[PDB]
Structure formats: C-alpha cells, structure tokens
Design a protein around this ligand. Sequence first.
Ligand SMILES: [Zn+2]
Lengths: 88, 50, 97, 84, 115, 133, 50, 52, 52
Amino acid sequence: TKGTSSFGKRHNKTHGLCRRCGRRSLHNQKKVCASCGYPAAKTRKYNWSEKAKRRKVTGTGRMRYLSTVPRRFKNGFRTGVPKGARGP
Amino acid sequence: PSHKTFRIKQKLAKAQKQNRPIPQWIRLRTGNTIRYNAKRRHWRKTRLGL
Amino acid sequence: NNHFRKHWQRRVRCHFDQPGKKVTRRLARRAKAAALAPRPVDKLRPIVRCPTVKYNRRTRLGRGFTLEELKAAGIPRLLAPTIGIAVDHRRKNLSEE
Amino acid sequence: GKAKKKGKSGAARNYMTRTQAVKKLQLSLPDFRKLCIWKGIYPREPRDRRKVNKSATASTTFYYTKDIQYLLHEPLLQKFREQK
Amino acid sequence: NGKVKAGQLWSKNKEELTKILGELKTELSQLRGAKLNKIHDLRKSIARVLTVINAKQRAQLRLFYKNKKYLPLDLRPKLTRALRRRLSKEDASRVLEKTKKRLTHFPQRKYAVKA
Amino acid sequence: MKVRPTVSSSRRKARKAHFSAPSSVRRVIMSAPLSKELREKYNVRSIPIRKGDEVQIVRGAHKDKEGKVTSVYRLKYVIHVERVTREKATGQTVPIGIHPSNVVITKLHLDKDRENILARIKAGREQVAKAKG
Amino acid sequence: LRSKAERQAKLAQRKMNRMARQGEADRHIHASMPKHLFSGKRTIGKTDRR
Amino acid sequence: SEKAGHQTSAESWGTGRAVARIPRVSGGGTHRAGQGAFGNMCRSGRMFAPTK
Amino acid sequence: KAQIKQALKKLYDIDTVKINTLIRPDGTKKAFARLTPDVDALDIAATKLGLV
RNA sequence: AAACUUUCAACAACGGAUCUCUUGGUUCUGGCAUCGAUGAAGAACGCAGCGAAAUGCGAUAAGUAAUGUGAAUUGCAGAAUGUGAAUCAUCGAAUCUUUGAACGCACAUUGCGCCCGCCGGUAUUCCGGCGGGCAUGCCUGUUCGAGCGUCAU
RNA sequence: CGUGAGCCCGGGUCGAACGGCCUCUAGUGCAGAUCUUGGUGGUAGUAGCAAAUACUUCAAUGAGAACUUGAAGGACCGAAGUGGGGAAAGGUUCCAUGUGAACAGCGGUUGGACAUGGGUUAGUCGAUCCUAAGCCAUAGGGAAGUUCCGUUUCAAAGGGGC
RNA sequence: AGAGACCGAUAGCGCACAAGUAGAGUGAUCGAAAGAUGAAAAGCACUUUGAAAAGAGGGUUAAAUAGCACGUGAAAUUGUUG
RNA sequence: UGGGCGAGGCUCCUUCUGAGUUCCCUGGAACGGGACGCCACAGAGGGUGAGAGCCCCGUAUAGUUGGAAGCCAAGCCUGUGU
RNA sequence: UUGACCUCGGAUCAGGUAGGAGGACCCGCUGAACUUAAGCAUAUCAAUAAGCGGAGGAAAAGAAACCAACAGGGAUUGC
Ligand SMILES: [Zn+2]
C-alpha cells in the first residue's frame, strides 16, 4: 500500500513561497529556500548547472536600472540641459 | 481553505483576473498571430502551485 | 610521441586573427608616430656583443647606453632619455673597443 | 479591537515628572532650572496623579510634555554644551 | 478642455501651480464617450503639473546649495559608484617635489634627427 | 560597391530593418517622386508622401488614376487615394492600398514645413552641383 | 465585424476540438510510454505490480 | 556549437523487452520525456564527429 | 475606514455613521458606508454620485 | 454471376514528405569598458477607453518633461492637432508601488514599535493618516566617561 | 538510352527559380541497429461499456428526451446516513442568465463544461497577543572559507528615584 | 558593428512563433511541440435547403485545382469507379 | 626654471547629393522579352503586385550646414633668480 | 582637592566606507574519480572538474640577492 493508498495522505506542504525569488521552494520548517538560498545574503548558484544559472542570470528579468547605463556612458555621463531648452 | 493569508488571496485575485479568453478585437489586428489564450487555467486541470 | 592525453581541446589556440592583429599593430604604430612627430618612433640603442661562445661572433642592439659611455660622450644621464637615447645602468664596459 | 494597557494612554502621555523631563532633556538640574526660568516653564498639577505616575506623591512635580519638547527645540542647549 | 500645456506651466510660479493642481485633482475626483478622453487629459495634465513643480523646486534647491560643501544625495551627481569612488583629478595629478624638480629642469624635449 | 565599414550588405539585416523600422523611418521609406512640372519648379526629385497630396498612379492595375491621399497607412506601407477603391461582397467600398513608389505626386499639400524641406533639398542639390562642377 | 469576430473565435478551436480538449485550458501531456511499464525485468522476488 | 545535442539529461532504460537501449530524456509532463538523446541517429541530438 | 470616511466628508460632503469594508476576490476593496438619518442616500446618489 | 480477398489504373481521402523561401541559429573578425547602500541583479503586485500574454511603464503607471523630426494612430470607438500628431526618434530633467545585499523589530502576519513634526476628526490627554528618522562592522574627528594604569599638586 | 547504379523525353499537377561541362569542397548515397522522430494499418465495429437492489406514467421545453423540469407512483440511504456543518487541501468550482463545437467512455434541451455578469460587510468569530517542543541573532570562540558552535557566556549588555 | 565555400524549421542554439514558455516534480531541477492563404481580404453579397454545423446555386480572385482545416501536397493506409 | 594667449589641426552627432517609370508584346501585376537613351569615385544591399544602376530608401567621393566637450599644436606676450 | 597623560568604552554625535550581482578571461586557496598503466597501493588523467575567497578593462608580472662563463648580456609580458 505504498502507492495509490499512500498518495491520499499527501495534504501538507514542505515548501512555501519565497519572498526573494518567488518560487514555491521555501522549506517551511528550515526557513531556507532550496532555489535561491534565502535568507543567506548571497544568491545560490553552482557551476554544475549551467541551465540553472541561465534561468536566473542578469537579463532574464526587467533590467530596470542597468539597461539605461550604456546610453549614459555613450553620452559621457553628462548632466544639465540642452542650451536654450525651455524650462525653469 | 476559508482561512487564508493576504499574500495568498492577492495571488488568487491575480489568477482570477487572468482567467479569461482573449478579446475578440485582438484577432482582427493586422499581423495578428494570437488565436486563443494559450495560458488559460482551469481549477480542475492545472494547479497554481501555491 | 603524441601529447594528447589531457583535455587538450579545452585550450586549443587558433590564429585566425593574424591579419587583423597585424592591421591593429600598424594602426597603433601610425598613431604613435603621429603623436611623437617630429621625433623618431624609437630610442637610440647601443651595439653589444651576444653572450656564449655560439653567438659571440655577431653583434646586435642592446638595451641602453652605459653611464660611462654617456660620460665619455658628454651627455648627462638626465638629459639622455629626454632626447631619444636609451639608458641602461646595469651594463658595464669591460673592454675599450 | 486591539487590547490596550492602562498606563500607556491619556494623562500619562500628557504629563511627565521633573526627573523624567531632566533625563529626557539630558541636562543637569541647574541648567534645567535656568532654561525653565527663562522660557517661562512652570510645573502644573494633573487631575489624577495616580493616572500619570503609579508611585506619585503630593511632593512631586509634573510638567507638560509639550513644554518639555519645546525646551528640547530651544537652541540655548547648544550654547550650554559649548560653554561646558 | 482639460489639457494644460507645459509652455504655459513654465511661466507660472509655485503657488498658482499648486492651485491649478488642486483644481485638476478636484475635477478628476468629481469625475470619479467624451468623459474617457476628459479623464485621460486630466491624468496627463496632472502629470505635467507635477513635473513642472518638481523641476522648479529642484532648481531652487540647487541654487540654494550652490555654494555649500555638502549637498543632498539626490542633488549630488549620479555617475556610477566606481566613478564616484575614483580619485579626484587634483589628487591623482598631484606629484612629489623631487619629481616636480626633475620635470622642471629636464622635461621631454621636442627633437629631430637628421637623415 | 560599398566602401564604408559602417555599411552592411546583409540581406537579412536589411529586411529586418525594413520590416521593423519605426514610424519616423517608415515616413522616409514611404517616399514618392514628383511630377516633371514640380521637379522643374522646385529642383527636387522626391519627397516623403503625406495626407493631402494629389497623386497619379503610374504602376499596377489602377494606372493613370488620379486623386488625393486620404490615409498614409504606414503599418502596411500603403497609401489610400480618393475613388481608388473596390467593392466587397456586400457592395461597400473599401480602399485599395497602393505603394508610394507606384505613384507620382502631381500637387503638393504645401505649408511652412514642406517649404522648408523643399528649400533644404534644393539648396543641397545646387551646392553639390556647384562643388562637383 | 462582430459576426466575423465570433467566426474567427470558432475557427480557432478546431485543432483543440480534434484533440478533444475540454476547453483551451486542457493542456495535459500524458505519459504515452511510462518508464514503470517499459523498463525493468520481472524476477522471482518482489514484483512492481500484481 | 560544442554543446549542441548535450544540453539535456538523459539516461538509458537498460536491457529489457520493449525498447532500444538509447538514452532517454528523464522527467515527465512533456513530449520530450522518454525520447532518445545524444545519438547521431536521434532527432535533437549531436551530429557525428562535430565540425571544429 | 477612517480614511474612507474622511475622504467622503472632504470630497463629497457626506456624513456616515458606520462603514463596513471587504476585499473582493478580484483584489479591490469595497466599502458600504451607511449615512446619517438626516441626509438621504437616494438624494445623494441622484445628485452627487449620478447613480439615479 | 455477385459479395469478399488480392492486383492494376483514374479521381477523391488520410498524412505532411519534397521543392522553394527565412525579421533565426552557428562560427570568425573588429571596436568599447559602463552594475550596486545616490539602493543593483532578481522577485511580486499593478498601470491601456475596450488586453489574457509578449512589450513598455510605476499611483506623474503602454507613461511626464526636454531636444529633434514634421502629420499621424488604426482592430473598433472617441477625440487632439502649429508649444505641433505620432504604439516616432533622441534623451542631459524627473516620477519610480511592495520587496530584494535590504537596513527599527519581524514576516507562513499587508503584525508590533520608538523619536521629532504635520493634517483630519469636539479635542492639552483620544483615534487614524502622512513627512523625516531609528541595521551591522570599520576609519577620522567631536563630545561624554571609566580604571589606586599612572603623573604633578 | 545505359550490362548497371542511373540519364533523357512525352502527358498531368504546379507556381520562382534552376541546370550541362572542367576543376574545388564535404555534415555526400540505407532495409535492417528490440535504431530516432512523426504518421498509418490488420486485429476490429472486436474485447468490452455486468460492484454500490430500480425504475414507471402523463404534461411541458425542444430539431431531437431512459439519464432536463413539474406532477403522479414505486423504491433506497436508515442518525458510525446517500443528512446537517467544519480542519487540511483546492481556488471561484458559489449565484443568475445564455450556449455551436469540444468534454461528461450511451445520449443530453442538462452540467463542477463553455460565454457574460454578480456575490464574501465584525470592538464581541478567528488571526493578531502568550508561551510549549524547537529555531534564529547578539558576547565570544573555531574554520582557508562558504560558514560552524554558542542562547547565558570569561560582556562596561540598565532601570528607577532625589 | 561587420562578415562566412556554415544550417535551411526532425537541420541550425532547448527556443526562427506570447521559449527557458506550456507542462511535470515536495524540491534540487527537468523541459517541449509549434514557420508559409493570397499581390491585395477582395476572407464569399444575395437566393434556396437545413434546428444548427453545413450543403447547393451564385459570387471574389489569375487561380478556391489557394476557403483563416488554408503554397506545393509524396508514401504508408482508405473510399468510389473500371 | 614661472605664468598667459594662441593661428590651425584631430575626435563625435547633425542639413544635403547621379540618372527612364519613353515606346511595343506577354501577363492579374513588368522588376520579363524587344527598341531607344542616361548616370556611374555610386552596377553593395533592401523594398516596390515576377530577375529594377536610372520608382523609393540607401550606395561612392569630396565636401557642406549647426552644436557640444576634450586633445594636440606652429608661434607670440611677458617675471627673472629671493 | 584640582587637573594632565595612558589604556579602554558610549552616542540615531560630524563626515565616510564594505557587503550583493557578474565571474568568458585574471589572482589565489582547496581538491577528485572515471580513464591509461594486464589488474593495481608509485604513476597517469591532473597540480584538471566540482567547492571557496578576491579584482579589472584587462588582470598578473615587472625594474635582478637574474642569466651566464661569453669579445659577456641586462625589468616584465607574449609569439
Ligand atoms: Zn527563494
């Protein structure tokens, strides 16, 4: 009875939702995420899984600040306004 | 259950708002390739995983 | 005698960038010449004799002129690198020639 | 519907004793007396002393909390510390 | 109606800009076919007025902190973290006195060699 | 043959740029030649087309039809001309999309900006002609 | 335009109706060749099924 | 690319009575699971003697 | 509830005796605001809210 | 003889091979050096008149300012257009929810605080909300101290 | 036509490129690998759709009614229920309209299906508060290090009053 | 940013498409299938038979022997006719 | 031996650039075939209803408008030795 | 008694700094086995993979306690 009958007893949760990475991989009793390794300061990644590294590497998300950096570099991190521009 | 947390209820609210077919004006756009909602979810078929 | 028993394919270096690197070197040489003009692109080097008994028949260019050579030619050691002369303090003059 | 403790609210926040006022203002008693005399701060008497301080006496003097905060904002404190 | 132009906004001083923002927010709150266009125009007008108010306030703050040693972090230049931590030009170009004497009396000369 | 290293002769890149160009680029792409009268008047060969121009169709099945541009539909790279329509099944009229390179502009919708464009093109053409002459 | 819209919506369903899916949310991929049925050998000791 | 045909986890199902002994993609819930891998005769596998 | 009654009083000049709030299954908050007996809810809905 | 089974042929089915195409891969080459406590990468939740996704964006939310171009967008509906359209380009000014190295304490909670101001509700006392703050190690300076450690008187 | 691998032509279908010759080049020729992927047969209209006692009449709706509804009957669960409510788990399946196909291994006008709308109101019920088994910081000590031990310590670890 | 004696949708990266998506697993992780009507939707008015889906006429197109099952449309296998 | 000008040059974004839609046939549509021309320091590439130097974007070389920030630099003014 | 030194502390004191990401290449630490040796404890794979720490546009190295034995060369790096 280790199969179908035993499967009816599965109604708890080993993992909850992690606040840092969003996956349902936060072990509720150890309070440690199996995916990203929260609450450790570093994010968990290993060199034996290139797939797991490329699932969460930079560029797979929104790039909210970092996408604007090359344009600012290209124009030389200048400040101010164009000459004669309308404003204050 | 009836007892639920705010985070759980918020994510269920997002799932409820996502559970819809595509609008019919989508298919008449030029160069349209969407024919149906390919991420449609049903309570008996695929689990939300919360 | 084939040394292919390590993971040699991880560190195979091809040289398809040989003409591109020659073009890059030539561009750098042009830029250096334009920046240093009208001075020559290189420094003055001495004539030295190669060591060992195999190569002592032949002379070649050395690193720089000795302090004794500069003193005998009347050029101060502080002026010498500023007018295109290489200076080498390690080399000595063991012979007059 | 949150449960509330007794000593937290009301006249307990409204009044404070001279000892607590001195410790809050981080002052010596002569400096506190000089500041009170110049600013015009005077003690006052609460309606129920036991509401303010549980171990309170007819001898002890209470003060107004806004008066103590106004003394805190007074800029003569920096002059006192500089002179010390 | 309901559209406020930025060129009209730039001439106005602070208090009437706040008044106009108050009326725009008030009539939007009372509104909460052509009503959809009106509420869209009200939203964009509120965005413009907030932008103009913020720009004028930051200009006044920069004028205020023009001759002070410490500026607020939002008014300090952004650059990058490494560019901020890099040595200043004066400190990087500062040189020792012996090297200064050597460069004074024996600099790199302009010379040519006859062929 | 192209000489400049910033110029690409790649068919794949060229087709990607053409079919994903933004609207301001598609405006310059959607350019039409002027008639002989307008060419001799303004010393300009071609201009980007816009709504309000009067065009003559010189290619296709609707050749020699003339009319005013009613829409410059840049998303399918076509224009719509007055009375150059067809009938659907129901009998309603739907416009037929014409590429701007199949037409010639016979009368220009002219204002200050179009005048400035014509002035710059004409001055540049005369400057190049004088320099190469 | 409306009639064209529901006609497009109905024609979008033909492949999933041929696959006999219960709506557009039925995207279950079943095991056509399960490992427990297609690997291993049966011995005299413990078996994996009766 | 030197990784083509090999960015997958596949193990052979052993000698048996039904299927050939090619390595097969592990897991479930998708079409790829149980399909052959790594062979030059396999769809979505590595070519024989990859070009260098 | 305090912010809701303050907002109603300052914007629409509506006095309420009590407010019950719930959060709907779509994620938005719904407020039932019972008005004072002197003011009429039908009159307020007809004039100010435009619900007729 | 028919039917059935098989063979051959034409047409029609089933299925998607072949051919032709390619806004995609792959490899080489050249140039460049620029993430983050001034809060990054990542995550969550939202935002369009009519969107579920992809894209863009953050309560100023398919966006604001500024500069340039110069007449659209388009699936429908509705409007605006020389400070001037645009799902345009550029981009130096801003906005930037909840989080995350994540920093008041916590967090399986939209939980509980402390300090200084402000606002609203009769309000010196009460209740809500808002603004600015309150993490750790280390450096320099300031100031307040401890030690018969120790000096002079 | 060629011994042959093959080559060439006619007829049909079709819609945008392709071939001969001499050199150059290779990811270059399949019946097998219980080969890989995809598709399709005979078996075969076959095996089967037989646990949980059971269904019938009239009327209505409808293109169509054994498995829709109303009434009329006959039965079953038999209070450790086939009843009335909850914890876990699910997440809108709840309610009202409407409905082609698909799904409900027979049908279907019915439906937990599909489409559009609506629905969850607290000072007193819970969470929130307390501590339990237990877990994590701080002092300090290990470890190349990610980090490990440590939870009262070999800590200047703070409260109150005049 | 420019190229190739490279591959041409079972190939080339797993991904030419709302692809690290859908889906599966408690989890670490595993991980697809899937491009092409037509130059232009001109995507079939109207009549008729059907409850409808659809059919038949009749239309659009150069072509429907291109009908949103959509370029070409092989073989296995199937129907009718001889 | 210290200071200050500095003609001019370089780097980067911006405005602009040659020539047939001439005639005949096929075709639904010429970008096909034929005749007559033109441009070319441009006959690279792409689009446009079929293979387009001359229909459109671009392509070549000299330049030519406008702006910002740096760098190099022929020379020229000056203090003179504490 | 009053003050000075020295050492050790406190502060939401004044002003700063570090963490995380990325890690193709770079500087270190730590560190296998399959494999190849008939097998196998030397060995080989390999001072490699995996694991940990730290940088930059390059890093590192670098101006001899060097090489030499010559009629002497003359920091480092790479071919
Ligand atoms: Zn996590």
